């Protein structure tokens, strides 16, 4: 199989069940919404050594579609453990969205995906020290928390789902610059797929990992040396000088599949791409297998 002359390896991404929330942040403008967004979703590439996996879902929510009539952005926050996710919701919304100029936080978990709920707004409202007030806004139960700016509006409760984490594909390129141009094109495409996010910096992984380590016994993960171009005994095709990985989390398997589909399609339009692969664990770890040949 080839897409625009680029080899698609007959392999699969191995992905996992993971708990996820989806939050709508609105603010006085898109600019201020993004300010809160970047802060709240930062230090959140991987649960290997980050507190969560977080990223932007929809970069632009029209003011006419938000509960308060203001510009919005949707983000997603995820973790393998639901209790840690609830902690991460409280911390990131309370430290990064409550503190952000003009930003409000509303639930954006689709009705069908909702399995559980965490009362993040209620838990945050105690910051008001007795002065907090419940109200209804556009049919939503919200807390109005007095802050020095005026008020912080946060929805009482946020829906939690079991989503899919670790959808992925590798871009194998003739050089680093060609690999990165291809990878950014992929991420631009993934931007448009609702319910999916790419937690790594710019959505791109420059340092893909393997489980554990061969030489050490204190490492949870180490470099995927099989795919390292400066490693003597690497398993890279000839003419492959750089590898990038795109890692995708989503509300469901279909959102991850779509993000993988449009990502690869976009990457294969860029020059100097040799082949597309995917990362898996030989079916021994995950709950999902997304086969590349099935997507096209």
Ligand X SMILES: O=CNCc1cc(COc2ccc(CCNC(=O)CC[C@@H](NC(=O)CC[C@H](NC(=O)CC[C@@H](C(=O)O)[C@H](CCC(=O)O)C(=O)O)C(=O)O)C(=O)O)cc2)co1
Please give the residue ranges that form the binding site for K ion (CB under 5 A). Answer: 21-22, 41, 44, 54-55, 57, 100, 103, 107, 109, 113, 152, 158-159, 161, 193, 196, 199, 206, 252
- Using CB under 8 A as the binding rule, whether residue 2 contacts a second copy is answered as no
> Could you say which residues in the range 116-145 bind a second copy, by CB under 8 A?
126-131, 145
266 binds, among a second copy, K ion, ligand X, none (CB under 5 to 8 A by kind): a second copy
57 binds, among a second copy, K ion, ligand X, none (CB under 5 to 8 A by kind): K ion
Q: HEC states along 223-242?
A: ECHHHCCCCCCCCCCCCCCE
> Could you say which residues in the range 64-103 bind a second copy, by CB under 8 A?
64, 68-71, 90-92, 94-103
Distances (CA, A) of 231 to 48, 158, 209, 228, 247: 23, 46, 14, 5, 23
Residue 49 tokens read as 């050594």
Which of 12, 106, 143, 244: binder of a second copy (CB under 8 A)? 244
Q: How far apart are CA 196 and CA 41, in angstroms?
A: 14
DSSP 8-state class, residue 195: T
161 binds, among K ion, a second copy, ligand X, none (CB under 5 to 8 A by kind): K ion
Which of 214, 238, 283, 284: binder of a second copy (CB under 8 A)? 214
| Helix/strand/coil for 267 | helix
The angle that helices 176-191 and 253-267 make with each other, rounded to 10 degrees, is: 140
Exposed (0-12), middle (13-18) or buried (19+): which is 118, by Cβ within 10 Å?
Answer: buried
Cβ atoms 96, 39 nearer than 8 A? yes
Name the residue with tokens 């919701």.
89
> Could you say which residues in the range 202-221 bind ligand X, by CB under 6 A?
205, 207-209, 218-219, 221
Binding site for ligand X (CB under 6 A): 45-46, 48-49, 94-95, 98-99, 122-124, 126-127, 205, 207-209, 218-219, 221, 245, 247
């Amino acid at each position: 199989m080839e897409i625009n002359g680029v080899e698609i390896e007959d392999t699969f991404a191995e992905a996992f069940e993971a708990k996820m929330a989806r939050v709508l942040i609105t603010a006085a403008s898109h600019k201020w919404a993004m300010i809160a967004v970047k802060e709240a979703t930062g230090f959140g590439t991987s649960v290997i050594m980050c507190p969560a996996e977080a990223g932007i879902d929809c970069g632009y929510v029209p003011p006419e579609e938000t509960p308060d009539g203001r510009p919005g952005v949707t983000i997603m926050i995820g973790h393998n453990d639901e209790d840690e996710l609830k902690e991460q919701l409280l911390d990131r919304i309370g430290q990064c969205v409550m503190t952000a100029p003009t930003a409000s936080a509303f639930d954006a978990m689709p009705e069908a995906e909702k399995e559980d709920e965490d009362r993040v707004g209620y838990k945050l409202s105690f910051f008001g020290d007795g002065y907090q007030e419940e109200d209804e806004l556009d049919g939503r139960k919200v807390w109005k928390i007095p802050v020095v700016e005026g008020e912080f509006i946060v929805e009482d409760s946020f829906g939690i789902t079991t989503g899919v984490a670790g959808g992925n594909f590798y871009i194998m390129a003739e050089s680093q610059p060609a690999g990165l141009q291809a990878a950014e094109a992929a991420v631009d495409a993934i931007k448009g797929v609702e319910g999916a996010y790419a937690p790594f910096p710019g959505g791109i992984v420059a340092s893909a990992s393997k489980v554990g380590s061969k030489q050490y016994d204190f490492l949870p993960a180490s470099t995927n040396d099989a795919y390292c171009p400066t490693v003597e005994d690497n398993e890279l095709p000839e003419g492959v000088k750089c590898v990038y990985e795109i890692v995708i989390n989503g509300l469901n398997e279909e959102a991850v599949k779509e993000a993988m589909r449009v990502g690869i399609e976009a990457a294969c339009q860029q020059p100097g791409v040799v082949k597309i692969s995917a990362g898996n664990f030989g079916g021994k770890l995950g709950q999902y297998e997304i086969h590349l040949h099935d997507l096209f």
